[PDB]
Amino acid sequence: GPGSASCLELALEGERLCKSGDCRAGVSFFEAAVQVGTEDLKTLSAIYSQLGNAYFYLHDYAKALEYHHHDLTLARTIGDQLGEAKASGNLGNTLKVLGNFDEAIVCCQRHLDISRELNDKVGEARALYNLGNVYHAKGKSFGCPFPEDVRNALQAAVDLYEENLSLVTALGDRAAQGRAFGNLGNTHYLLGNFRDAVIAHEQRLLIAKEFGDKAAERRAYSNLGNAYIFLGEFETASEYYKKTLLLARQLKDRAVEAQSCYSLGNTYTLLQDYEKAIDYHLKHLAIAQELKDRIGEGRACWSLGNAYTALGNHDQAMHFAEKHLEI
């Protein structure tokens, strides 16, 4: 009665608050809305779906799984083909993060299949990107970052992302393109198709620069740096690694300053400028002191000592070694 009205109102404050960067409050409003309760089952189910998504973004995958599973069940109750496909996708993506790869696959496939039956091309592209991500995580998860199931999972992600790119091109979805170019690039990378990794990551660059997505932009320079190292072109990687270090400064991200610092530190180890590693790995040990990742200070000390052993300063290297001995 008066509740089926205060429920939806309470949902909107939950909804609004999550687009505004505060899901931690919006959840409380979603949870409040559920306490009150409506009797329109598509409305309650939609609240479950948003509780699920809000907990996803907040990193409570456990309670996220629980809410998407509820929304899915209601969808089957109600017979809402389209609700069921979206809840299947969300279950899928949640299970993927939990490492329930095999069930992730079935759920994303259910999302895709219904999307296709309905001739929903937006749903089909989203379902395709989700299925790709599952295969991609499945293969990335195996071992250290041999088994033929790895190659086969990764190859399956390549086909899925390429299928997705083809659909979101046709739909004009520049942001979807960038996301598929990045995951596709990183998949080609793990397969040893480095020439194809560069091609995809250059598309992600362009689209990130276009949107002004300055986090994505450095993301691609770094990923580009990775791929040139394995290509053996260490000077290009250095070029790309520096570019990442700059965007880290303006972003005021002392973290990716360091990761970019250590990595171009390690890159010139292959180029004999042990100073660039020194000058960087000291910025590494400094910022890692700031964030208590001093663990890497020993990694910097282990790399700095070994640049030193090729290049003098034996007493400074033993001091680095002495600190590395700290753990």
Binding site: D40, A46, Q50, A87, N90, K96, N130, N133, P145, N186
Partner: peptide, 15 residues
């Protein structure tokens, strides 16, 4: 290797 975000389906609130 820095990936791309996952993208969930949103099921907005009906009137």
């Amino acid at each position: 290797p820095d990936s791309e975000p996952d993208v969930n389906e949103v099921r907005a609130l009906p009137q």
